[PDB]
Design a protein that fits this description.
Largest sheet: 8 strands, parallel, barrel
CATH architecture of the largest domain: Alpha-Beta Barrel
Number of domains: 2
CATH topology of the largest domain: TIM Barrel
GO cellular component, one term: cytoplasm
Pathway: Amino-acid biosynthesis; L-histidine biosynthesis; L-histidine from 5-phospho-alpha-D-ribose 1-diphosphate: step 5/9
Strand content: 15-25%
Subunit structure: Monomer.
Oligomer: monomer
Keywords: Amino-acid biosynthesis, Glutamine amidotransferase, Histidine biosynthesis, Hydrolase, Lyase, Multifunctional enzyme, Stress response
Structural class: alpha/beta
Bound molecules: nickel (II) ion
CATH class of the largest domain: Alpha Beta
GO biological process, one term: L-histidine biosynthetic process
Shape: globular
Length: about 525
């Protein structure tokens, strides 16, 4: 209550706030949540953090409706330190095209606009960097990486940067594709980041720490060798080659949670191991009692105490009927996982039903699918589609309704074309839907990322299905993650150099300890690729 500095965090109670609070505590601070203006007072507050995730209007409506506008402005006028994170940063602007009708605090007189997806995937999901500058602050290091996850940004041009400079604003710039945008701002007592420091490992914690202690340490004195190695060369649009570690979560006989089919601290510990070994993100495949007491939620909550990178959970995110008969829609189930520590949810089977219905309605959605409800509330960046396809040959496009493509490898009868058929219920059942049609429908519906598995390569340890990746990349404009088949570092290299995969996921190879995320990163690094090394 006074035995340690107190940090007040404005909580609109929507989204994952576990990471931010755990980071602050981990830094030696006590967290005081502020769900209402009644929960804090100007003079009694020395450190205020405004975290925000999701649709711009959603967050700003919520915030302003609870009466935080005046309290926030007054606090800012008090001259005391305030930190905005992600939407907290956007809230400082005039508004956002994401929610046309919305209005911000307008400290910066222009709106956030959507990234250009003609040249790159949108949303931006990954590790970008601040452009070297003389006016960086709070320790922002151009040679480190921070995690960004957003479709909208304060996109810059010469005119806006000049006005900002004349307005006395210090701007940390970043570039995604050919577009420059505000990664961070600083003017007097106001500080805000577009990236999630709490989701940016040690580099992130340093930023929060530098803020809480109000200090801008100089960046390390790297050697010219190190700089050339650590600098952003803007390959892959400026994002590092994202390495994802995945683990299964099962309930054995005794009813305990384990990762292996034969054995809840195991899943937790492994996730921690992964994080410690460089994983840029950890995915839990929930394959395991009232919703409130789901064991998976505890794994996430426990993992979130020390794992400061994005967490993804797939499985069970759908409309459900609780133990008391209460009907709980997908949206509320997701919110439960998010508030528990998850940053993204993976939709599998329902994604196929959604896509199918989507075409039935003539390429439109009814806004009732988990994809639509969750993405509209939390943004596309929060919804991941897990796809489980299987190659199917045909003599020509004339043999099927689904889009096919000329393959370099002929079929049993010499068929030179093929499409990938999707499956559901753990790949136990097939559907008359191609992956081309499935991904395009889900994207239209609001999915922000595609987890591209491959039934045929799963468990093989012989590399990814490269034509599949390219096939899906031709289909959608959202990030595509290569999964299934990864066995050795070389497979990651092949995917990043021979295909347009936006990330690579590994499971068994990391689980069996054959290699670590770092082994893979060292390899890629040694081969000219850019990887997060924190
Ligand atoms: Ni105290």
């Amino acid at each position: 209550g006074s035995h340690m500095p107190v940090v007040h965090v404005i909580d609109v109670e929507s989204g994952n706030l576990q990471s931010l609070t755990n980071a602050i505590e981990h830094l030696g601070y006590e967290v005081q949540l502020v769900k209402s203006p009644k929960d804090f007072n100007i003079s009694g507050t020395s450190r205020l953090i405004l975290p925000g995730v999701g649709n711009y209007g959603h967050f700003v409506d919520n915030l302003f409706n609870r009466g935080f506008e005046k309290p926030i402005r007054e606090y800012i006028e008090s001259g005391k330190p305030i930190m905005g994170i992600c939407v907290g940063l956007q809230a400082l602007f005039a508004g956002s095209v994401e929610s046309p009708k919305s209005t911000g605090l307008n400290y910066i007189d222009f709106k956030l606009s959507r990234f250009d997806d003609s040249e790159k995937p949108v949303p931006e999901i990954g590790w970008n960097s601040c452009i070297p500058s003389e006016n960086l602050f709070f320790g922002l290091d151009p040679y480190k990486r921070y995690y960004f996850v957003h479709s909208f940004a304060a996109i810059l041009n010469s005119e806006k940067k000049k006005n900002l400079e004349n307005d006395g604003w210090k701007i940390a710039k970043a570039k995604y594709g050919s577009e420059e945008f505000i990664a961070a701002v600083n003017k007097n007592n106001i500080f805000a980041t577009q990236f999630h420091p709490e989701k940016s490992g040690k580099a992130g914690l340093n930023v929060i720490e530098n803020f809480l202690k109000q200090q801008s340490p100089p960046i390390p004195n790297y050697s010219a060798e190190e700089k050339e190695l650590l600098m952003n060369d803007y390959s892959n649009y400026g994002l590092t080659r994202r390495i994802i570690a995945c683990l299964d979560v099962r309930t054995n006989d005794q009813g305990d949670l384990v990762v292996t089919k034969g054995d809840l601290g195991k899943p937790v510990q492994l996730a921690q191991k992964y994080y410690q070994q460089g994983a840029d993100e950890v995915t839990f495949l929930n394959i395991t009692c009232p919703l409130k007491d789901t064991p998976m939620l505890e794994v996430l909550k426990q993992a979130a105490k020390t794992v400061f990178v994005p967490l993804t959970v797939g499985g069970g995110i759908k409309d459900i009927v609780d133990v008391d008969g209460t009907k709980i829609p997908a949206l509320e189930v997701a919110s439960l996982y998010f508030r528990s520590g998850a940053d993204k949810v993976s939709i599998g089977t329902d994604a196929v039903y959604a896509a199918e219905k989507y075409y039935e309605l003539g390429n439109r959605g009814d806004g009732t699918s988990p994809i639509e409800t969750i993405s509209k509330a939390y943004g596309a960046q929060a919804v991941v589609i897990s796809v489980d396809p299987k190659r199917v040959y045909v003599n020509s496009q004339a043999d099927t309704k689904n889009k096919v493509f000329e393959t370099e490898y002929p079929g049993p009868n010499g068929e030179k074309y093929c499409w990938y058929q999707c499956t559901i219920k753990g790949g136990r059942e097939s559907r008359d839907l191609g992956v081309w049609e499935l991904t395009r429908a889900c994207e239209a519906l609001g999915a922000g990322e595609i987890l591209l598995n491959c039934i045929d390569k799963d468990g093989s340890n012989s590399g990814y299905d490269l034509e599949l990746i390219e096939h899906v990349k031709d289909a959608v404009k959202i990030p595509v993650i290569a999964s299934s088949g990864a066995g050795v570092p070389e497979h990651f290299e092949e995917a990043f150099l021979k295909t347009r995969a936006d990330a690579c996921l590994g499971a068994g190879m990391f689980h069996r300890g054959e290699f670590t995320v770092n082994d893979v990163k060292e390899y890629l690094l040694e081969h000219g690729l850019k990887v997060r090394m924190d």
